[model samples]
Target: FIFDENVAEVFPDMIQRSVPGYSNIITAIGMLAERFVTADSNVYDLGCSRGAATLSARRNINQPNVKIIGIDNSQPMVERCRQHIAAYHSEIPVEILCNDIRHVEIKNASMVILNFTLQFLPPEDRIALLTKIYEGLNPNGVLVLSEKFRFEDTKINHLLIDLHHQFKRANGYSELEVSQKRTALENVMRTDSIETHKVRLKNVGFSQVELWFQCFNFGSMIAVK
Candidate 1:
């Protein structure tokens, strides 16, 4: 589904509130990226919708010579990102590419972010994609992934689901509109349990992998190659 201009304007705020401790969580991930990547690093923001994380990355590191690439499949998002990049007039060589993450080539990347993405793919495809990402990274490259997760306990699962819906209502979405949007998102969002994601990362040959931040059912992971 595509978000129009009005929807896009509020999407980031909605996301930050929906997930608990969102800003601090991402900031921690940014710090990890800063520690691993250098001034000459090639950094990538995969599934970088609207460039929020890309901009955050810029502010997180002091790498004036770093080349940052933000990639997304949405044409409108890419166009919007380009406008912001031009407005900033950044000399750090920021670039946005309208492309799919699954097939995108990210050779020699020192850091890569997959925030709130990757659950949209099927299990097999997800594993294969992870393998590809592992191969694409430079030596000592870091990959960060953030996503919603499922709980094995049925009761907690239902509670979190209801809480998420409540969050939508609190954000000014009507109950009906929220329900409709939730249904539409569920059709394309393919989430698994945290254990499953960890195993998949391990199977893909990441030498060091761990969950860096987690709140309720949302989490962020770091995998080193």
Candidate 2:
């Protein structure tokens, strides 16, 4: 099922604010994309989800030579993205496809964005998927990842989780609404510590794995092959 329009409208903003250093976080990801992707580069966004991140990346770079392809399994979300493209009359050449990101080919992509998508996979499958991404990436390619993470210190983790809940309440989500969303997400999303992700990247043959941005428990990184 797709998120309702009202929920979707506020979701991206919630994410941006929930993560610390939101503007700088996106800027850092954009800089990595610009550094890794040339003007004539193929960029793929896995689990594009209404194209919020994809559109933000495009705005940040504004490179005419780049081609952005956004893939998501939700027909409603993809349709919304297509409408966004049409309404904006953007000429940067964006293709929104309804496809499962796990099976999507990554060949010829210079930069790939997997924002908040990996946690949906089980740990073993996540590693296998990263291996597949590594094999399909061009030499010296870059992958940007953003996801929720658990803190090594359980006390701090709980505090941050509660803080995030407060943020949600302040943003107008009722207790029931927020609880339901949290439960649904937790049922599907599986997260790990930063150290665990770094190890997984190394095991998958990433030459350089570094966290570029972090906001509490939400973090993003650039892993280079």
Candidate 3:
């Protein structure tokens, strides 16, 4: 489950197949940037593996003096993300850092994105990390937080689990592949309920919080400061 060289190699394709409605999410991020990204501010793609969200933000942001900063803990992921950004010939400046998002300073940010990256962090650290993002955000700034969430009820949880696995199977992953992937994520990927996410965002001082996109058990939340 570690985002090492192995996972970094297959990340682009892996995300497309594994997450339901992933491309739609990426597209929505760009649209959000077009609306919320302010001039002379930074756009952060935290846990920016391969820099898909960073590319989206860079492409959609028409404001002047805006820079995109992408941070990832994995060296392999950082290198690949830098290559991806370079491949896209754009005037917007992009800086990819090979470091943990928690360690990085988020300053003057108009938009911050955590695309399925928060679930990998230690549960105890989630609050502090989010609080940092909250403090660093400019007024009316948006945080696009996406994650695979759990249901509070056991019956609903199991049903969604089955449906989510079925979704993966429909996307060409075999039963064994699904099981193995689940096992790999069992220890490392810790999911909170959707309600828990809202509560956390509100407690951290977001003026508005909404679940903008959802498919099965996966969803993206928009929290505005």
Candidate 4:
């Protein structure tokens, strides 16, 4: 789990193989941005690994006076993300910063994205970070959160986990790779049930919380202010 150079080098391939519906989620982020992004506002891609979501939002946004800021704590990721952003041709100003998401200032944002990033944080800290984002959002702003989740029901949870592993296997990961990756992520990634996410977003003051996409145990949500 550390998003070091080794992980950054293969992140694109790794995520596509490991997370079901990842590409679809990334594409939908752009679509959401097109609808939710306001003129003269900011768009944040917190924990932006290689700026996939950042670029997506930038591509679809047509509003005037919008800025895209991508933040990642990993130096390796930020470096690659900057290069990736530079290669693209766009009028929307984009900045990729190497900084912890928790420490960054969020304000005047119409859309914020956390793509498979929150599960790595300590459970105690999740609420505070979310609250900060909620408070920073502009009226009618939206937060797109994608995560690896668990079900409260024992059998359903177990079944989804099995199917997810099968998904990886079918995507070309070997059994050893699957098991080892699971072990490495055990301590770093802890998931919450979908109900927990809904309640937490509601508690954090989101006017609307919706599960927009899901596959196996992985899902994406939209919370509007």
Full-model lDDT for every candidate: 0.77, 0.75, 0.89, 0.90
- Model 4 ranges off by over 4 Å: 175-183, 186-188
Residues 1-225 of candidate 4 have per-residue lDDT tens digits of 577887788788778878899999999999999999999999999999989999999999999999999999999999999998999898999988999888889999999999998997889989999999999999999999999998999999899989987898898855343346644775356799999999999999999999999999999999999
Indicate the worst ten consecutive residues by lDDT in candidate 2: 171-180
- Worst 10-residue lDDT window for candidate 1 reads 173-182
Please give each candidate's TM-score: 0.87, 0.84, 0.95, 0.96
Tens-place lDDT digits, model 1, residues 1-225: 455564455566556546665677667766876788776778888878777778777767776678889988877777788777767655677889988888888777788888887876666678877887888788888889888888889999888878776765675544333335645786567788888888888889999898888876778888999
Tell me which of candidates 1 and 3 scores higher on TM-score: 3
User: Could you tell me which residue pairs clash in candidate 1?
Assistant: none
* Candidate 1: stretches off by over 4 Å: 3-9, 173-179
lDDT of 2 by residue, 5-115 (tens): 554555556455445555566667667766787666678888887676677677665655788899987776677777776676566788899888877777777788888
Model 2: lDDT equals: 0.75
User: What's the residue-level lDDT of 206 in candidate 4?
Assistant: 99
User: Per-residue lDDT for 150-213 in model 3, tens only?
Assistant: 9999999889888887887787655343346645775356799999999999999999999999
Question: How high is the lDDT of residue 62 in model 2?
Answer: 61
Clashing residue pairs in candidate 4 are none
Give the Å error, residue 74, model 2: 1.0
- Residue 19's lDDT in candidate 4: 88
